[PDB]
């Protein structure tokens, strides 16, 4: 905004809220979001499960 810098090549999704006051190039790559979670142990003692 303040022009103290120039074109800033950095990870930044082309979002409308930014786009309203920011000029943006064409996407060099796409982007998505998703669940990221550990692999569940899913283990029951079983020796005294009953």
């Amino acid at each position: 905004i303040d022009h103290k810098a120039d074109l800033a090549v950095a990870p930044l999704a082309i979002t409308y809220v930014r786009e309203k006051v920011i000029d943006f190039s064409k996407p060099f790559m796409t982007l998505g979001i998703s669940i990221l979670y550990r692999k569940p142990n899913g283990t029951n003692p079983g020796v005294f499960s009953f």
Partner: peptide, 15 residues
């Protein structure tokens, strides 16, 4: 997948 966002390059007004 949830959203298809786009990675572009920032640039100032009218540059």
């Amino acid at each position: 997948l949830i959203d298809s966002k786009g990675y572009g390059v920032g640039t100032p007004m009218g540059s």
